[PDB]
Ligand binder design. Structure first.
Ligand SMILES: *[C@@H]1O[C@H](CO)[C@@H](O[C@@H]2O[C@H](CO)[C@@H](O[C@@H]3O[C@H](CO)[C@@H](O)[C@H](O)[C@@H]3O)[C@H](O)[C@H]2NC(C)=O)[C@H](O)[C@H]1NC(C)=O
Lengths: 227, 209
């Protein structure tokens, strides 16, 4: 019945700090080292460091030296991870892990490499100072089938809904997931593939809706001048 | 700093044997781990100490570490085995992960991606901004790598790419954006978006003219 339960999701401003906790149970807290692995959205796993609850000695990855502090409270069977001087690329899912390895760097005489056998459910941390902001919409004009769309740019916070021709056009429509730019604002695109023969007769308007800001924008996507 | 090299994608059919490799300098000297991450949940340890299975892990999963490569092997692959797989080792007590490998159990034939490259709209250029939009659609398996080129030189800054998501037709789509100044747009003869899918590259090109 070994398990790790983590604290709730957090949104933080760049330059500040964030502290995530993790409670261990099902085994004697002082017997195994606990560490933190993070994962940027859509990226791989990135190890941050570990703490030995027996003695409190820590070992951090070089990339986070000077920015991270890991602590433990044996009475509550809880470890903490505090990351300071937050930047936009610190937006990630932060996993609490149990490392059965024995590291010299946290007081073990004989180094022994095992692995991370238990993972917590993860804590989502978002770094952005942005407030609620409606999006600006730009057209992705087209020149057999043609591709057209509209660019929903710099909004906050997710989500935004996109329909075409007040919902009349659904075939071939794809609305992509949003990407968090370093500015702290979200942006996505919505595409629809149409027959080229329709471009001179059929008007195409994408309808964006941003509920957090009560922003509704209709943008007409005209074909371009040239071929 | 030590690095582990994994192939970004590996595909098999139901019941076939999947093999995911992980390469590193003298990797056979070190201990390796393999983690399985299904969409939406935490990673799971499937192999530790090169070839040991934690209790409860199916015996289809096997591992081997020799020379400079570590290998995870899944015999008789099932649909539930679709996940990202990470190799992991240590470099002076520091934990190191491979880039990860997307494993796809093929449920349909492969499909080459369709690439459409949108120049910056005149409404954006008139607003003193410029964004290139590379839209990729109708490909399978859902794994692509996007590379931007200024004329013939690679661009690295200002590139943001989304993770491939499923369409309504069970095929995948992805997007990539290159933000630059309006002046960077006019100063080059052409910009290119290269989408490599299953070893072959499809590229589109736009120009400020
Ligand atoms: C056995 O040795 C350990 C050190 O290896 C001693 O633990 C240390 O105890 C001191 C005093 O309690 C800790 O400092 C204090 O922490 C408390 C936390 O509430 C704080 O209120 C105090 O102001 C002070 O900072 C110290 O952190 C702790 N060190 C470690 C590594 O845990 C322990 O006391 C020794 N046992 C005996 C019976 O002497």
């Amino acid at each position: 019945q070994v398990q790790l339960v983590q604290s709730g999701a957090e949104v933080s401003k760049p330059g500040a700090s964030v502290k995530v906790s993790c409670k261990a149970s099902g085994y004697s807290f002082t017997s195994q080292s606990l560490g933190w692995v993070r994962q940027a959205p859509g990226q791989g796993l990135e190890w941050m460091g570990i703490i030995n609850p027996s003695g409190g000695i820590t070992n951090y990855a070089h990339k986070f030296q000077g920015r991270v502090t890991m602590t433990r409270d044996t009475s509550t069977s809880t470890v903490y991870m505090e990351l300071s001087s937050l930047r936009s690329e610190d937006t990630a899912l932060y996993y609490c892990v149990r490392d059965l390895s024995h590291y010299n760097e946290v007081g073990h005489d004989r180094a022994y490499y095992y692995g991370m056998d238990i993972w917590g459910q993860g804590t989502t941390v978002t770094v952005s100072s942005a407030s609620t902001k409606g999006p600006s919409v730009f057209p992705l004009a087209p020149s057999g089938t043609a591709a057209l769309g509209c660019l929903v740019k710099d909004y906050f916070p997710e989500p935004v809904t996109v329909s075409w021709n007040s919902g009349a056009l659904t075939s071939g429509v794809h609305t992509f997931p949003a990407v968090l730019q370093s500015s702290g604002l979200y942006s996505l695109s919505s595409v629809v593939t149409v027959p080229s023969s329709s471009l001179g007769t059929q008007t195409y308007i994408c309808n964006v809706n941003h509920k957090p800001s009560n922003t509704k924008v209709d943008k007409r996507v005209e074909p371009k001048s040239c071929h | 700093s030590y690095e582990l090299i994994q192939p970004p994608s590996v595909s098999v059919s139901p019941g076939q044997t999947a093999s995911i490799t992980c390469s590193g300098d003298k990797l056979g000297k070190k201990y390796t781990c393999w983690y399985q991450q299904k969409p939406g949940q935490s990673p799971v340890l499937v192999i530790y100490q090169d070839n040991k299975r934690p209790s409860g892990i199916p015996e289809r999963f096997s591992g081997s570490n020799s020379g400079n490569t570590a290998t995870l092997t899944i015999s008789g692959t099932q649909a539930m085995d679709e996940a990202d797989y990470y190799c992991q080792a240590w470099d002076s007590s520091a934990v190191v992960f491979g880039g990860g490998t997307k494993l796809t159990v093929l449920g349909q034939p492969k499909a080459a991606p369709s690439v459409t490259l949108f120049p910056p709209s005149s409404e954006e250029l008139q607003a003193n901004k410029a964004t290139l939009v590379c839209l990729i659609s109708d490909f399978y398996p859902g794994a692509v790598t996007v590379a931007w080129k200024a004329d013939s030189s690679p661009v690295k800054a200002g590139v943001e790419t989304t993770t491939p998501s499923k369409q309504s037709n069970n095929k995948y789509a992805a997007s990539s954006y290159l933000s630059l100044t309006p002046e960077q747009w006019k100063s080059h003869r052409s910009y290119s978006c290269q989408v490599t899918h299953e070893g072959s590259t499809v590229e589109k090109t736009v120009a400020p003219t």
